[PDB]
Design a protein around this nucleic acid. Sequence first.
RNA 1: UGCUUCUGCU
RNA 2: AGUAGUAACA
Length: 661
Amino acid sequence: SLHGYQLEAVAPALRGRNSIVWLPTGAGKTRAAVHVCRRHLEGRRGGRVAVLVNKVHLVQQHLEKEFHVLRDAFKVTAVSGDSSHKCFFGQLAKGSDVVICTAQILQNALLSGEEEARVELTDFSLLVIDECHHTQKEAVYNKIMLSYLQKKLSGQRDLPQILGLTASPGTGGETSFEGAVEHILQICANLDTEVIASAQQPTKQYDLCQEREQDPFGQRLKKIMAQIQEHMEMPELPQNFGTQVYEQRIVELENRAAERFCRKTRVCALHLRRYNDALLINDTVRMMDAFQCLQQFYADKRDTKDPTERFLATTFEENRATLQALAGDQRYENPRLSKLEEILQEHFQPPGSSRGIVFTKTRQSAHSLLSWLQDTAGLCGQHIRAAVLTGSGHSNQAKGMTQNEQQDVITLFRYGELNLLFSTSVAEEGLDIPECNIVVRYGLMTNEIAMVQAQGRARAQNSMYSVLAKANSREVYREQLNESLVGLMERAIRAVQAMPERKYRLKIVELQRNAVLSWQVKEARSSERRQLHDPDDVYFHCVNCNVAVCRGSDIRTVEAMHHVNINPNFRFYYTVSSGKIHFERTFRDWEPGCRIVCSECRQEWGMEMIYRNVTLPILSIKNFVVVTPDEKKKYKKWSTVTFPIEEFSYLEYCSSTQDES
RNA sequence: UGCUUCUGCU
RNA sequence: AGUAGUAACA
Ligand SMILES: Nc1ncnc2c1ncn2[C@@H]1O[C@H](COP(=O)(O)OP(=O)(O)O)[C@@H](O)[C@H]1O
Ligand code: ALF
Ligand SMILES: [Mg+2]
Ligand SMILES: [Zn+2]
């Protein structure tokens, strides 16, 4: 049965008041919400609840661990990206008493032009927003709630009650009391909160490592980078190799070289980014991980004419064997990994006692840590059974994990079939593993919310939380600051809870008005930008070889995301460059075909979309330079281009191609 | 693998 | 204004 503090925290929600339930990590906010939902549905006819989450895995978790109990009396349905294609959301939701989904599923339905796929906010009488601290800025939670505010302020009746759940509203980067209070008020405004409802041990250790005394591998990479920069014959080139600033500056240089079609500079900049990437890997995991980064990059090359590429290939080849030999030398081991080994050795003896998550920033790092573990003699024999856990992010450096793949790892971790995960931020919030008693945060730079949340995955009574970071580093400073900011957040929330009602209400009104006005202004500005140029006056150039390949007027959008070229002669500019792509996820109206490349230079451009009975090429914006009358620009997003793009019409497209045959 | 939110960084 | 990552959607 519910704890006293659970009953106390939901008392406002039971009375119908919009609220945020502020309870610590692991305190049982979900069960409290289920109780609210049961009483809500019992207390009226025709009620309907939406439960919004921010991570695919939490749909299944909340259903199977908490919300399924409602099925004694009510119909409960769950939807995530994997199951999206199976039903029209409108039909599914309307046939349910409770629907649990990732928030973007609901947002898509709110925006839909299809009768059967569409819902309105007024189709729900209660919205439960899990991890509601994400309801800010342009996060999907806030896109939904901004619409709610627009409707509320316009006088709409029968908007749903709001129940937000969070352990950590945060301070939003504010370090003053006044700033932190303002942030809390902003959260409250965004969620249309009437009351923040709250209640009326673990140990933490800093496992600090030192910089490697001797890093010949890194030293050699830096010496190659200097040689490459000399070859570029340019003044004021950055010298700060192996930093995030260098990474930014070298990519910005690549962008400028694309925009001005300086091939030599661009190619050199491309390679330097890879060397910098290797330095960053070298600092995070093993030398051999960094080596493999570079080796793979240069292996996938073939013999070419381009004198620049030949210089760069020769340069790597001259250093390759030395780099690999160094990478196999235990003398130059990463102290971060030495420290991690110490932690695991201490806590996973005797074998199978501990149940741990090691959080790392990137998917690639998680995979490298698993590989490192499997290859560390000092850990083999301690019956550590480990696996990687990531979300469904994807890049050429690392694929993601499907909902199903994630679920397999989580289920085996829950009762100790696996006893250690190497995880990204996919599992920093929400994941409930009662037996988890160790969290290590490996060299992370995050806000205080992520710190609190990740720590909170260790549910067990006698849990430990380890910060594994470089001594004297910004990472250590930020951890310490974040600890203080948690305290500041608490003080700010208390102050808001104690505010006089009249003052609170007026402040919320002022903030909600500001939010809905600011949105209108932003939308007007965005529209003005996208109407600057006639699409006929915009030309796309291949980013690699600078050949012109189409005009803006050749492009249409599918599902407001996928930019297809509908010109029947575009086929003479691109080549199909792969066998058929397969995705685990199925979509309603299309599936990928093959990858496509520039016919001149083989630069990757995008992929085919098999949309119903036609095949069209999708272009990724990052593979082009966009040329207008005013400038040449390499865009990383379509959303900021300076010309309008019409929606694809399948009917019109079919009619048009039939006339040509 | 198309998309662009968030977080870090400048 | 970018950049890097990440996650979500498709
Ligand atoms: N009243 C209760 N009695 C026993 N276990 C409970 C109670 N309420 C919640 N739990 C359990 O507490 C754990 C943490 O709950 P959860 O909802 O994941 O925490 P959070 O507040 O971070 O969402 C879960 O395993 C849940 O089933
Ligand atoms: F605060 Al939680 F799962 F919602 F730790
Ligand atoms: Mg939770
Ligand atoms: Zn080309």
